UniProtKB/Swiss-Prot annotation, chains A, B:
Induction annotation: Up-regulated by IL12/interleukin-12 on activated T-cells. IL12-activated cells expressed enhanced levels of DPP4 but not mRNAs. Down-regulated by TNF. Up-regulated in migratory endothelial cells and in the invasive endothelial cells in tumors. Induced by hypoxia.
Primary enzyme class: hydrolase
Topological relation to the membrane, as annotated: Single-pass type II membrane protein
Tissues/organs with expression: Expressed specifically in lymphatic vessels but not in blood vessels in the skin, small intestine, esophagus, ovary, breast and prostate glands. Not detected in lymphatic vessels in the lung, kidney, uterus, liver and stomach (at protein level). Expressed in the poorly differentiated crypt cells of the small intestine as well as in the mature villous cells. Expressed at very low levels in the colon.
Name of the protein in question: Dipeptidyl peptidase 4
Stated role: Cell surface glycoprotein receptor involved in the costimulatory signal essential for T-cell receptor (TCR)-mediated T-cell activation. Acts as a positive regulator of T-cell coactivation, by binding at least ADA, CAV1, IGF2R, and PTPRC. Its binding to CAV1 and CARD11 induces T-cell proliferation and NF-kappa-B activation in a T-cell receptor/CD3-dependent manner. Its interaction with ADA also regulates lymphocyte-epithelial cell adhesion. (Microbial infection) Acts as a receptor for human coronavirus MERS-CoV-2.
Domain notes: The extracellular cysteine-rich region is necessary for association with collagen, dimer formation and optimal dipeptidyl peptidase activity.
Membrane side Extracellular: residue ranges: 1-728
PROSITE patterns in the cross-refs: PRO_ENDOPEP_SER (PS00708)
Main location: membrane
Entry comment on modification after translation: The soluble form (Dipeptidyl peptidase 4 soluble form also named SDPP) derives from the membrane form (Dipeptidyl peptidase 4 membrane form also named MDPP) by proteolytic processing.
Reported impact of residue 47 to A: Does not inhibit dipeptidyl peptidase activity, interaction with ADA and homodimer formation
Amino acid sequence: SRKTYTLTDYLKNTYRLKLYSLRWISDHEYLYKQENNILVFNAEYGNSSVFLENSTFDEFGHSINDYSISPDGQFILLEYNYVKQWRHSYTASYDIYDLNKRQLITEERIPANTQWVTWSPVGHKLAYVWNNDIYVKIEPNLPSYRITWTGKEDIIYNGITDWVYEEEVFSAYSALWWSPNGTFLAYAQFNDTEVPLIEYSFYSDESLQYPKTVRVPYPKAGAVNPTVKFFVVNTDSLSSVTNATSIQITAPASMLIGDHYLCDVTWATQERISLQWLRRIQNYSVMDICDYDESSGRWNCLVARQHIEMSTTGWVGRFRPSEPHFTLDGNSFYKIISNEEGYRHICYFQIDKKDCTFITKGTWEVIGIEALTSDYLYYISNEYKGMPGGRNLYKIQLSDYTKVTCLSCELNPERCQYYSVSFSKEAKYYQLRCSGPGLPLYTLHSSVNDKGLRVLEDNSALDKMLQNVQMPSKKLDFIILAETKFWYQMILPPHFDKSKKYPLLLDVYAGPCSQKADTVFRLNWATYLASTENIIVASFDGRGSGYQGDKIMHAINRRLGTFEVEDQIEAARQFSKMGFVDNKRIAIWGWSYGGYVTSMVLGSGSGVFKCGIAVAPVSRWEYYDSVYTERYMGLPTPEDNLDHYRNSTVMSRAENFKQVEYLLIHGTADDNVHFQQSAQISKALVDVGVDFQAMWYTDEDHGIASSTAHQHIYTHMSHFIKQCFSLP
Amino acid sequence: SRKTYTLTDYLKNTYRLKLYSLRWISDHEYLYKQENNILVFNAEYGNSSVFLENSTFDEFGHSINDYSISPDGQFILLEYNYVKQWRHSYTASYDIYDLNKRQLITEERIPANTQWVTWSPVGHKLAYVWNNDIYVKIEPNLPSYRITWTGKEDIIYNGITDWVYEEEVFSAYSALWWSPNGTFLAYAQFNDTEVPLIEYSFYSDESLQYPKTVRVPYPKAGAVNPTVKFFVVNTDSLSSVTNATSIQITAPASMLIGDHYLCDVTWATQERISLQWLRRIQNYSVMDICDYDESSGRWNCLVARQHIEMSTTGWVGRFRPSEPHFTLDGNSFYKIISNEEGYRHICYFQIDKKDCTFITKGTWEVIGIEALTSDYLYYISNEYKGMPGGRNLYKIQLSDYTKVTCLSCELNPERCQYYSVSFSKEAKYYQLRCSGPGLPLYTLHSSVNDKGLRVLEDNSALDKMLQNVQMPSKKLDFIILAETKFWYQMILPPHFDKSKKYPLLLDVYAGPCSQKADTVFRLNWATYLASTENIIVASFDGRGSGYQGDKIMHAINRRLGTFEVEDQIEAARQFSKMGFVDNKRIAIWGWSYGGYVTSMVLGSGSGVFKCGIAVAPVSRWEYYDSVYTERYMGLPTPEDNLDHYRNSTVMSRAENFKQVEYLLIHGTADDNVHFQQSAQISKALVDVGVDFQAMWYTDEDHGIASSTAHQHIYTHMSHFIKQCFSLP
Ligand SMILES: *[C@@H]1O[C@H](CO)[C@@H](O[C@@H]2O[C@H](CO)[C@@H](O[C@@H]3O[C@H](CO)[C@@H](O)[C@H](O[C@H]4O[C@H](CO)[C@@H](O)[C@H](O)[C@@H]4O)[C@@H]3O)[C@H](O)[C@H]2NC(C)=O)[C@H](O)[C@H]1NC(C)=O
Ligand SMILES: *[C@@H]1O[C@H](CO)[C@@H](O[C@@H]2O[C@H](CO)[C@@H](O)[C@H](O)[C@H]2NC(C)=O)[C@H](O)[C@H]1NC(C)=O
Ligand SMILES: *[C@@H]1O[C@H](CO)[C@@H](O[C@@H]2O[C@H](CO)[C@@H](O)[C@H](O)[C@H]2NC(C)=O)[C@H](O)[C@H]1NC(C)=O
Ligand SMILES: N[C@H]1CN(c2cc(-c3ccccc3)ncn2)C[C@@H]1N1CCCCC1=O
Ligand SMILES: N[C@H]1CN(c2cc(-c3ccccc3)ncn2)C[C@@H]1N1CCCCC1=O
Ligand SMILES: *[C@@H]1O[C@H](CO)[C@@H](O)[C@H](O)[C@H]1NC(C)=O
Ligand SMILES: *[C@@H]1O[C@H](CO)[C@@H](O)[C@H](O)[C@H]1NC(C)=O
Ligand SMILES: *[C@@H]1O[C@H](CO)[C@@H](O)[C@H](O)[C@H]1NC(C)=O
C-alpha cells in the first residue's frame, strides 16, 4: 500500500473537513459565505444571489474578523481588532455599514474596547457593553442611552458575566436578553467585591522587561461566590433628559436564604420572562414565571407559578438545569427532566397547573429539544439501536404522543449515525448535519412532508483524498462491568491483524456527564497514532459518563476520582484480555479532567500502565472553581465533604509514580486549571524522589491553542509515546 | 576491582570533608565547637577549657540555629526560628543569656521578626534592625533607644540593605558599622520608592488554596536604582527623653551629579571613617576620608584627601573597588589596585599625599590583604609556580619591599597548593586552611618566627575511606589560544587509558572574573561522572576569566556572550584533538552564568556539542539586575550599548538548537535570575519548532538547594547525560 496519515498531516491540516455553515434570516432564507461574497439562499427552491460582495470593504483599512446583519437586513455590524479573553469572552472594535445607503456610519460610533454588541431580535436596535456598563442605540446613527452607572473593572459587571458565570453557568460572555419584540432588555448584574483573586505571571513578548501579574476574581471550592441581581428596562420609553429606569426582579424566598446562582433566562412572550435559580448546594432549583404589570411598570412573580426541580441522587440537570421551550401563547412549556427510572425525557408543563406529563420514555435519553411548532416537537436522542453514542432527529405528534417519527435514522444508516440540526425561524426548513461514522454530510429538508430538498456538502473532495491514505478504522462496542453495559471505542491501525499484538494507548476524559465512545468521524492525533505508529487508541465510558441515565451518571456523586479512575483501570485490564494487545505496552493520556484521571490511574499502583501523559490536569479539587467542583463534591468542610476532597488528590499518590514513566504538561497562563495544580504535583513527586518528565508552555492557557504551541505539544508527546513503546 | 564514587554517595554525603571552624576572640585565644561544648583554645600551648556546655540550653524549648558571644565574653546571643530570605539575609528570634549570672534575659527582649543583630566590637552594646528601623541597647537587660523613624517595608531600609545592595554591592544584609570603640554607629539608608517590583507566584504547601504573589524591589538593567544616604550616631550621648541625632555624611560633588552607589565603609580610627563611592557608570570611584569635628559634632571630608580610582579598559576592581587596610594611626593605608601592566598589586597610600607606591609587581596577582602589623603585611597571591589557580600566604617586610617570604609554599607542596588564612587580632597567630589538591589540611602557626605549632585537622578518616574507592584524578594544565596561556582542568576516570576514547562533559561558568581551573579538592557531581560513568569532566578559563590580569579579564568589557562563549567552543575543539576524547560524545552544562554560556554555545551552530544542560540561565541582559549587568555592559540605550544587549540574547539563536539535545531547568521562586529568563527561552524555542527538554522546580530559588530538589535535579541531569552518551 501507500501513504499513511502522518503527524505533519494532523498539525498542518492537510486533509480539511468541509463544513456548510449557514445563517437563517427568515423561515425560508439563509446566508452563506461562498468565498469573496455573501450569498442569500432560498430554502424551498435553492436559487441564490449575492447579498454582499466582500469587495465592499477593500478600503476599510482593518481585517474584519466577523459580521452580524441586523434582523431587518438594513445594517451590517463589522467586527475587527478582535482580542481573545476567556473561553467565550473577547473585546473588539465595531463599525456599522448602512446596506441601503451603501456607506459607513461616521457619527455616534460604537466605542473602541467594546465588550459585547447585540442586535434586538427584530428591527435594528443595539445593546452594547463598554467599561462594564450597558448602552442602548435605538438607531445606528443616533447617540446611545446609558442604562447602568455601576460598572467597575473586576468588581461590578452589567450585561456581561464574570469568570465563573462565563465558564460554568452561562457558557457565554453575554448577560443581556432582549424581549422577542425588542421592547424590553433584561440583564444580569454580577458583584465580585469579596471574590478572591487568582494571580499569575504573564511574560508577554521578549521586549517586556518586567513580567505582568494577571489578577482575576475566581472563587475556588468553598470561597466567597459573586452575587447576582436581575433587571429589566423598557427600551421604548428611554429619555435623553432623564436616566433610564431599571426594574429589578428579585430571586424567590427559597433562594434568598443563602448562596444561589441565576442559571437560566427565557422570554416566554412579550410580557413574560422565565427565570431559573439554583442554590449553592446544586440539588435544588426553582423556576419563576414573571409577568409585566402594565398599570404599575413593575414585574410580578406569583409563588404558585414556581416550579421546583430537585435531585435525590445527585445534582440538577446534566451540567445545569435544562432550558424551557415555551409554546407560542407562553402558558405551557416542554423541558428535559430526569424521570422516575433516572432517564432524561421530555416533560410537558402547564403554568398554573401542579406537575408535568412525560411525553417520551425508555432506556435512552433525549439530548435536546430543537424546535416546537403547533403540531410537532422536534428533538435529538440516542434511542436508535440502543447506542448511547448515536444521535438522531425525531418528531413527536403533539395530539398523540405514541406517534413518534425518526427523521434522520434511515437517510444513510452505514454512513450517518450522529446528527445535529439547524431549524429556520418558525421551523419551516431544517439543515441536518451528520458528523459520522462516515464523512460529514450536510442536507436541507422541508418540515411540511419531511422531503429532502438538496445535499449541501457531501465531502466528496476529502473522500477521494482519504482513499489515497492508509486510514485507520473505528470499532464501537461495549463490555460488561458488574451486570451493566459500558461502551468503548477503538481506533485500530490499517490492515488490522487480530493474531498480532499491538501497543495500546488509552485516551481518557471521564469527567461527569462525559462521552468518549461515540459514532463521530475525527481526524486527530489518534488518527496518526494508529495510521503511522500502529498503536490502538482506545476510549472508555464508565461510571459518571453521560447519556445513559442517572444510575451511571450519579455513581460519581460526592466521590470524584474513585469509580471513573477504577473503571479506566478495569477497561485496560479487559482490553489486555483481548489477544491483540501487548500487555507490556499500555499507556494512558488525557487533557484537563483527563489529566486528573491519567495522574490518578498512574498513582493507583495497578501495574497495568507503563507510561502516561497528563496535560493541564486538576490535582486537588480545592484548587478548582466553586461552581463546577461543588456541583459534584459538595463543600470542602468537616461537616460537608472535606474527607473526600483530601483523599482524592494526585499529590497523596506520589509514591506509586516510581512504577511508571510520567510526562506532566501545563501552560503558565492557564486561567481555568491554574498552573498551581501541576506546580503541586511536581513538588509532591520531587518530595518523594520520583523521576518524571515535565513541560511548561509560557503564556499558553488551557487550550495550548497557539499554532506553534499546539504543534510543539503534539510533537513532544509523540516522541514520549514512541520512546515508551520502543518505536523508531 | 572494588567500589566507585556513586551518585548516591554524592547525594547522601557518604564521604564528608572535615573542617576546623575556629573563632578568634583575642590575640592568643579562639573558640571551637567540639561536640556538646564550646571550648576556648590557647594558640601558643594548645590547652583548652570548656567555655559553655550545650546541656545549658536543654530546657530552652527551641532549636538554636547559631550563637554569638559578646566581645567581653559576658553574654551569648542565641539565634532560633531562623527564616532564610535572600543569599545573605534572614529573620530570626533572639534571646540573650548572662554567662556570669547563668540565666536568660527575660526583660526588654530583642523583638520577634528581627532582621539583623550586631554586638559592638568591644564590650556588650547591641544594634538591631526591626521593621526597617535601627535600635541600640547599651546593656542587654535595658530598654532600646530608637535611632530611625523612617523605616517602611520595601521602601525605606535603615541599617539593612535592599535586594540589589545585598546581592551586588555589600554581599551582606547588614548596613551598620560600629566604630572600633563602639562609640559611634554608622549606617546607610536605602530608598527604593521608584524601583520597579519583580513579581512571581509562590505556591507554598498543598494546604494553601490561592498562590501568593511575591513582590520585590529589583532594578533590572537600566531601571530606576535605589538611592543611598549615610549617617553616624554617637551611642554614648543617647537620651531616654530626646530623639537620637544622626549626622549625615554627604557623597562627594563628583558623585552627586547623577546615579551613584556607596560601595565601602571602613573605620580608620575612633574618629575617622573611609567611604568609597562608585558612579552608576562603574569606571570611576572616589574614596572620602571623614573626620569627626569635636567642636561642632559634625563630620568633615576634605576634597584634598579624596582618592580617585578609575579604569580605562573596564570596570573598577574585580567585582567592586577593593577595601583599604589602614595602619594603626589611620594616616596611611594599603589597597589592591590594578597596575600599569594590568596586574592587581598592593598599593601604599598616605592620606594628605598625591598618589601611591606599589609594594608588589609581576605576572601574577594579589588575591587579598589578610593582616597588617607594624613590621609586615600578610597577603594571599597566585605567584607560586606561575599557577593562577593556586593560592599561597606571603609576608612583605614594610622596611624593605624586596624582602618577601612565602609562608605556605613549602609546607606540603604535593598535597597543598590552595590556601586561605585566619589571623588572630594583632596577628600573633594564623590558622592555615589548605583546600587542595590533596585532602584539606588545617594548621596553626605563630607569626613571630613563622613556626608551625599544631595540626588541627588532617582528614585522616576520609583519606582511609577514599583509599577504598575508585577515585578519579585531576589534571591541571594550559593550552595556547592566540599567543596566550589559558588554563583548564580535567577530572579523568580511574585507571585512565590514553589510547581509549572517553565521552567529554564541559563544565562551564565563564562569568567575568571567574576561575574554574584551580587546585582545589572537590567531592561533587563531576567526581561521580568520572568515577562511575567514566566521563571526562573538563573546565576551561578563557577570556573574561580572573586572577590573570586585566588584558584577559577586561577582554569581555561591554561584550558579554562573545569571547567567553567562543573560548568554550575552542577549548572543546582542542580537547577533541587530544586522542582520548570521543568527538561524537561532547556535552556542555552550566548553572547561572554557566547556563547562559551553555545556551549560547548550543545556539552557536558549531556542531561540536551533541547535548547540553542549562540550569537557571540568564537569557537576555535586560532581565538581570542593573548593578551587575551595567558593570560589564553599560546601559541598554542607543546612546550607550543597546545594540550589544540585543545581539547577546539566547532567544535570537533559537534556530540553531535543532542541531542539539537541550535540557532547560529553572526554579519558579528564583528571586535572582527570574523564571522569566527561561520562560522566554522556551517560548522562542517553541516559536521556531525546536523540541527540547524542560524541568521547573516549584518554589525553588537560584540554588535549587532544598534537600529533595538538589537530589532530584542531579538525578534528572544524570539520566539526561547517560542517554545522550548512550550509557546504561
Ligand atoms: C457589591 O457588594 C458589596 C459587598 O461585597 C456592597 O458593598 C457593601 O455596601 C454596603 C452599602 O453601601 C456597605 O454596608 C455598610 O457598611 C458601612 C461601613 O463601612 C455602614 O455605613 C453601613 O451601615 C449604614 O447603612 C445600613 C444599611 O444601609 C444601616 O445599618 C444604617 O442605616 C447605617 O447608617 C453598612 O453596614 C459596605 O461598606 C459594603 N461591603 C463591602 C465588603 O465593601 C456593594 O454595595 C455592591 N455593589 C453593588 C453595585 O451592588
Ligand atoms: C429566487 O428566484 C426568484 C424568482 O426569480 C427571485 O424573486 C424575484 O426577485 C426580486 C427580489 O425579491 C423581485 O423584485 C421579483 O419580483 C421576484 N420575482 C419572482 C417571480 O418571484 C428570488 O429573489 C430569488 N432568491 C434568491 C435568494 O436569489
Ligand atoms: C592554658 O593553661 C594555662 C596554665 O594553666 C592557663 O593560664 C593560667 O590559669 C589561670 C586561669 O586563667 C590564671 O589565673 C593563671 O594566671 C594562668 N597562668 C599562666 C602562667 O598563664 C590558661 O587559662 C589555659 N588556657 C585555656 C584556653 O584553657
Ligand atoms: N469548567 C468545566 C465546564 N466543563 C464542561 C461544561 C459543559 C457544558 C455543556 C452544556 C452546557 C453548559 C456546560 N460540557 C462539558 N464540559 C468542563 C470544564 N472543565 C472541567 C474540569 C477541568 C477544566 C474544565 O475546563
Ligand atoms: N549576582 C552576581 C554576583 N556574583 C558574584 C559576586 C562575587 C563577589 C566576590 C567578592 C565580593 C563581592 C562579590 N563573586 C562571584 N560572583 C555572581 C552573581 N550572578 C551572576 C550572573 C547570574 C546570577 C548570579 O547570581
Ligand atoms: C411590543 O411590546 C409591547 C407590549 O408587549 C407593545 O406596547 C409594543 O408597541 C410592541 N410592538 C410590536 C407588537 O410591534
Ligand atoms: C442536597 O444535598 C444534601 C447534602 O448531601 C442532602 O442532605 C439533601 O437531602 C439534598 N437535597 C435534596 C433535594 O435531595
Ligand atoms: C524616598 O525617595 C522619594 C523619591 O523617590 C522621596 O519623595 C522621599 O522623600 C524619600 N524618603 C526618604 C525617607 O528619604
